[PDB]
Write a protein that binds this ligand. Structure first.
Ligand SMILES: O=C(O)CCN1C(=O)/C(=C\c2ccc(-c3ccc(Cl)cc3)o2)SC1=S
Ligand SMILES: [Zn+2]
Length: 728
């Protein structure tokens, strides 16, 4: 609480902006305004200074003062907190708006006694805050709009009565962003009004009494969130942005002047991946390979994407058979860009993962250990205290599935509130397994980047300084999420995510305890031995907590749509083989439940979900959008289909390990109905079975019906397998 400095700083701040100009009693008056302004959060006084504003404590008819003479006379008739018209040459306060803002307060000492006046002064200050300060950083916005609606659409109308004008009282629907746009003056007024009631200690109770939400809002805002407001406000100031950059630049001056050529080379290839060059791709294929290249109709594969498809296409132009699919599986590995940061993210930092050829694995490890040694100097310095860094991010990176509907379908400048709430839901902690490249001062994002992180670094956080005003951070950072809200920047809506850096171990302990909890819970629900390790969280990336919290939801859906005894028999079977329900955010090829049972590396599979018979495990990737699989639940249940196809076919030739989807009986059922369900289900036997199984146990009962009337024989089949397994 080295707050005495906050008083001394509030003292020094007053020093500049506060200009006393009275009779001669300059002491009883001067120290009177000190008591009046002390009630205000220090940080709003500094914001006012930032925008060049000044405070004058004068005597008599305030409209007389120099700064208010240039006042179009009509502006000489204001309104008090209560909305009753008054006359500036009769009032005691006024806040001149404009590019040279001014606050004029008629001296007094009874601000202590006359609560009404102080109240009014605070209201004018509240007005300065919402009309002169926050507007320069596009606030108030959605968050505050929510408070306003909470109030208008609340049981007791008293809240409205206390803070709303009839203009807002009578407004039909809630206050949209568009409303706050053409009624700016209006919202700013309510803000100031609530700010006022909150600041004047006598009225605080009334505010909390009839308008709790407004109270809680202004409470949190004046205690913590205002500091960030000041921060964002300083971020628009040129000299402020440059001063910050300079202190950081010189803190790392020695680190820089000492970086070698190899040093710089490393940081650079870490910023720009090296794309594969045709010339080499070709000179790595024996003629046999080479002609099967010119022969194979690239555009016929499946596992290959556009760029991958395209790139390959130029390999022919430069010079589905089971074997040739095996040829492409290889090329897919060799045509991937050398992207250090991508490698860390894909593996969650598990760089020994046998998901790529040994030669490149080693080159990635060599470059990574080297980068890890380069970024040895922590940010902590004597040139500054708390330090904020910024990062513009593409939401698909966290959740493609939600990223799909983030932007408003009709108006791309808007963020869809529904998806926003869902995205914000269980976002509490995050992890960085690669090197975050952040900006010293916030900068404009790319079109696909509607996520703007404001990260508070630890003085411990290690980083590297880049000449262009960015920092490369050490890998393995821990991040707690402090606030997620919609903001507007340059005619465009973004999702501001306020995060604080903490030790990665703190977050891991949270995940690790979560794993313990979820297994304790489901081992009991399923009747498994107390300590079986069934569910496993392999979490290492930026949407970390979501992977964790979605697991509970996924398994709950899983249990509420399937026969309890079907679950038990099957999961006991899985457990018997050391199976696992793996929820991860690293690509599947790096989960060993899959890779330790591969013959070749290229035989790897990455997708939304995957069932591995050898390990009897279900793997579910969080970040991606399952091939048009509504959500994670559908995907997990789909994978459970394969699980069943396994346990049923096992109860078939008991003495073996074959799938019940291989039976001639089903193959024929597929031969006829294999196209009635989904395209993905059309893929093959087991897939058709899994898709069918999935729809049958969908939450959408209409879904179930589709199978029943478009795959009747299949429907009756899956059911046969169910009773089979249940009674066996
Ligand atoms: O590409 C896709 O989108 C489908 C990925 N996917 C699958 O590929 C699924 C399971 C799966 C596929 C193939 C196999 C398989 C499993 C073992 C062996 Cl030896 C051979 C193939 O399991 S579940 C799922 S989703
Ligand atoms: Zn499948």
């Amino acid at each position: 609480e080295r707050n005495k400095t906050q008083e001394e700083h509030l003292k020094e701040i007053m020093k500049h902006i506060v200009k006393i100009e009275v009779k001669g009693e300059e002491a009883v008056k001067k120290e009177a305004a000190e008591k009046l302004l002390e009630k205000v959060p220090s940080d709003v006084l500094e914001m006012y200074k930032a925008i060049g504003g000044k405070i004058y404590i004068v005597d008599g008819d305030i409209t007389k003062h120099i700064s208010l003479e240039a006042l179009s006379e009509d502006k000489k008739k204001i309104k008090d907190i209560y909305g009753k018209d008054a006359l500036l040459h009769e009032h005691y306060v006024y806040a001149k708006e404009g590019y040279e803002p001014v606050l004029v307060i008629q001296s007094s000492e009874d601000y202590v006694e006359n609560t009404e006046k102080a109240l009014n002064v605070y209201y004018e200050i509240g007005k300065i805050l919402s009309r002169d300060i926050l507007s320069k950083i596009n606030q108030p916005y959605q968050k505050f709009l929510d408070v306003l609606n909470t109030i208008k659409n609340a049981s007791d109308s008293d809240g409205q009565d206390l803070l709303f004008t009839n203009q807002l009282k009578e407004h039909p629907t809630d206050f949209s962003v568009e409303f706050l746009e053409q009624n700016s003056n209006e919202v700013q007024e309510v803000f100031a009004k609530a700010f006022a009631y909150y600041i004047e200690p006598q009225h605080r109770d009334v505010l909390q009494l009839y308008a709790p939400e407004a109270f809680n809002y202004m409470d949190k805002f004046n205690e913590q969130e205002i500091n960030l407001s000041l921060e964002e406000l300083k971020d628009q100031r040129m000299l402020s942005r440059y001063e910050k950059w300079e202190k950081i630049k010189q803190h790392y001056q020695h680190w820089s002047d000492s970086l070698s050529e190899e040093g710089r080379g490393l940081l650079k290839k870490l910023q720009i991946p090296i794309e594969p060059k045709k010339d080499d791709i070709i000179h790595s294929l024996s003629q046999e390979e080479k002609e099967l290249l010119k022969r194979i109709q690239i555009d016929s594969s499946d596992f290959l994407s556009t760029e991958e498809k395209e790139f390959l296409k130029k390999l022919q132009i430069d010079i589905l058979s089971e074997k040739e699919k095996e040829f492409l599986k290889k090329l897919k590995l060799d045509i991937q860009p050398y992207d250090i940061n991508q490698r860390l993210q894909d593996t969650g930092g598990l760089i020994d993962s046998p998901s790529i050829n040994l030669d490149v694995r080693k080159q990635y490890k060599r470059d990574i250990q080297n980068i890890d040694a380069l970024l040895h100097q922590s940010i902590g310095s004597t040139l500054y205290n708390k330090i904020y860094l910024y990062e513009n991010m593409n939401i698909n990176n966290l959740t493609a599935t939600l990223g799909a509907d983030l932007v408003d379908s009709t108006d791309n400048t808007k963020i869809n509130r529904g998806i926003f709430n869902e995205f914000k839901k269980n976002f509490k902690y995050s992890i960085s397994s690669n090197y975050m490249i952040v900006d010293i001062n916030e900068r404009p994002a790319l079109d696909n980047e509607r996520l703007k992180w404001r990260i508070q670094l630890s003085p411990d956080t290690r980083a590297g300084y880049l000449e262009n005003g960015k920092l490369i951070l050490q890998r393995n950072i821990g991040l707690e999420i402090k606030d997620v809200q919609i903001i507007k920047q340059s005619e465009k809506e973004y999702i501001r995510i306020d995060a604080k850096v903490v030790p990665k171990s703190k977050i891991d302990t949270k995940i690790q305890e979560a794993q313990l909890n979820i297994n304790q819970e489901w081992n009991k629900a399923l009747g498994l031995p107390k300590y079986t390790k069934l569910i496993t969280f392999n979490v290492h990336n930026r949407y970390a907590s979501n992977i964790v919290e979605s697991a509970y939801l996924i398994l709950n859906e899983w249990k509420n749509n399937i026969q309890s005894d079907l679950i038990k028999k099957v999961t006991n079977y899985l457990v018997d083989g050391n199976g696992r329900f793996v929820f991860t955010d690293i690509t599947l090829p790096n989960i060993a439940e899959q890779y330790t049972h591969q013959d070749e590396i290229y035989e790897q599979v990455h997708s939304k979900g995957l069932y591995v018979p050898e390990s009897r495990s279900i793997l579910l990737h969080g970040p991606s959008k399952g091939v048009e699989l509504r959500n994670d639940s559908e995907g997990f249940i789909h994978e459970f289909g394969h699980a069943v196809d396994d346990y049923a076919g096992y109860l078939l030739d008991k003495n073996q390990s074959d799938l019940v989807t291989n039976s001639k009986k089903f193959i024929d059922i597929f031969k006829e109905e294999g196209s009635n369900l989904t395209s993905y289900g059309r893929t093959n036997e087991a897939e058709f079975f899994a898709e069918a199984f999935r729809l049958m146990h969908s939450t959408d009962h209409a879904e179930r019906l589709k199978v029943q009337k478009n795959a009747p024989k299949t429907f009756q089949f899956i059911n046969d397998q169910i009773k089979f397994i249940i009674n066996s």
